[PDB]
């Protein structure tokens, strides 16, 4: 009978490769259906542009893909209409803001699966032993804990030790992470909602310009080409006070055998000030069957059991990734395994998107523009002010005679 073949995650992070392809299989199992997964490389730029390579060949090679939340509106001529498929009951079951997220001109074009929201990383057990009570709620607060724990463990011998570790690399993540900088010193979205490009201003040139401060300092020098793996491997062996990441992390430093198993929280990212708002980039992912696909039936028979609660519910369990179903969040094994999922939901309720709504099929043009400014500021390259005032120019050339 048909292969259903899966293109989705990417085993270079942490579990989520391997434990998509069990689940592929698991589905296989269920259904007596032949099923392959094809692998990703880690970074989701580079996922898309692999994905494309299929796209443009009309490929039938790959019947289901995980997309990005950016992406609806880049991939939807090669999605299949998932709405005929779904009835309104089922669809409702999911966060409304992600299907409509996920719809383009009426196309659903890819179901929900788990969402995501940046998040600080803090060692509990560093922060009493330096005196603190709590993680730090402001950025200044975030360098002046990090300087002070720094100078202690470098003094106490470990030449590894750093304050923060986050993802400065130029690629998507990075969009991410400066998108969280901006917006937490009330500097804007980069681009709103309305079409107003509004990254040159100085809220937004001063915090890429703390973002440099970082960098050799309570940030190692390389941080400028950490994606989310290799800062998390800081972390993780131990070597850093505090870490932006995503919910992944979680699991995985709680893993028997981690250095760092019961010595971290989470919190929200710190804030200029206390009447900035609070930034949390949106992530998350979704599955898209392929217009493309032999296999329709099929590949949407699949994509509705990867999205189902008990695969969710072991995404939650298991690799800490946060459901798309309301109902997830009060379950009581979830919760009692990630606890934290209760504490910071307003966190991911209230997260910050990056501009795909409003940049659409140009969204990954735009994102490119947007890293590679940020990315020669954190170099050093140029200082924010310009940086700021550069990418307002490079965006306004790539969404003229853009509308949404
Ligand atoms: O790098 C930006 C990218 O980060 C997040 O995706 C992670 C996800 O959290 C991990 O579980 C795993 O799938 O790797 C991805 C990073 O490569 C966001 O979900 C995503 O929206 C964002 O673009």
Redesign the pocket.
């Known amino acids: 009978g048909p292969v259903i073949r899966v293109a989705g995650?990417?085993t270079a992070?942490?579990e989520?490769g391997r434990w998509m392809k069990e689940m592929v299989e698991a589905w296989g199992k269920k259904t007596g259906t032949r099923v392959e997964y094809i692998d990703s490389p880690?970074?989701?730029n580079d996922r898309l542009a692999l994905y494309q390579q299929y796209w443009a060949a009309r490929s039938p090679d790959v019947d289901v893909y995980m997309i990005?939340?950016?992406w609806p509106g880049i991939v939807a001529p090669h999605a299949l209409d998932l709405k005929p498929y779904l009835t309104e009951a089922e669809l409702k079951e999911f966060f409304p803001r992600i299907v409509q997220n996920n719809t383009i001109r009426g196309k659903l074009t890819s179901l929900p699966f788990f969402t995501?929201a940046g998040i600080l990383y803090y060692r509990k057990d560093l922060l009493e032993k330096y005196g603190y009570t709590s993680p730090p709620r402001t950025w200044n607060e975030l360098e002046q804990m990090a300087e002070r724990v720094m100078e202690g463990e470098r003094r106490a011998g470990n030449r590894d030790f750093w304050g923060f570790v986050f993802?400065g690399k130029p690629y998507?993540?990075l969009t991410?992470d400066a998108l969280e900088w901006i917006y937490s010193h009330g500097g804007g979205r980069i681009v709103e909602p309305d079409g107003t490009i509004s990254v040159n201003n100085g809220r937004a040139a001063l915090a890429l310009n703390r973002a440099h401060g970082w960098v050799g300092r309570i940030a190692p020098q390389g941080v400028t080409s950490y994606?989310?793996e290799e800062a998390r491997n800081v972390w993780q062996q131990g070597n850093s006070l505090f870490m932006r990441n995503?919910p992944?992390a979680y699991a995985l430093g709680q893993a028997e055998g981690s250095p760092i198993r019961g010595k971290f929280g989470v919190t929200v990212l710190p804030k200029a000030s206390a009447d900035a708002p609070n930034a949390a980039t949106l992530?998350?992912?979704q599955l898209m069957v392929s217009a493309y696909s032999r296999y329709p039936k099929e590949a949407v028979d699949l994509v509705k059991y990867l999205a189902s609660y008990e695969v969710q519910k072991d995404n939650a369990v298991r690799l800490s990734?946060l459901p798309t179903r309301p109902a997830l969040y009060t379950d009581r094994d979830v919760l009692a395994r990630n606890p934290w999922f209760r504490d910071l939901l307003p966190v991911f309720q209230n997260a910050v998107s990056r501009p795909s709504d409003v940049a659409g099929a140009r969204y990954n043009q735009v994102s490119e523009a947007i890293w590679t400014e940020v990315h020669s500021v954190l170099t050093g390259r140029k200082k924010g002010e310009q940086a700021v005032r550069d990418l307002e120019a490079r965006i306004r050339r790539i969404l003229r005679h853009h509308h949404h």
């Open positions: 995650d990417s992070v942490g989520g880690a970074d989701t990005d939340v950016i995501d993802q998507e993540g991410c994606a989310e995503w992944y992530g998350g992912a990734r």
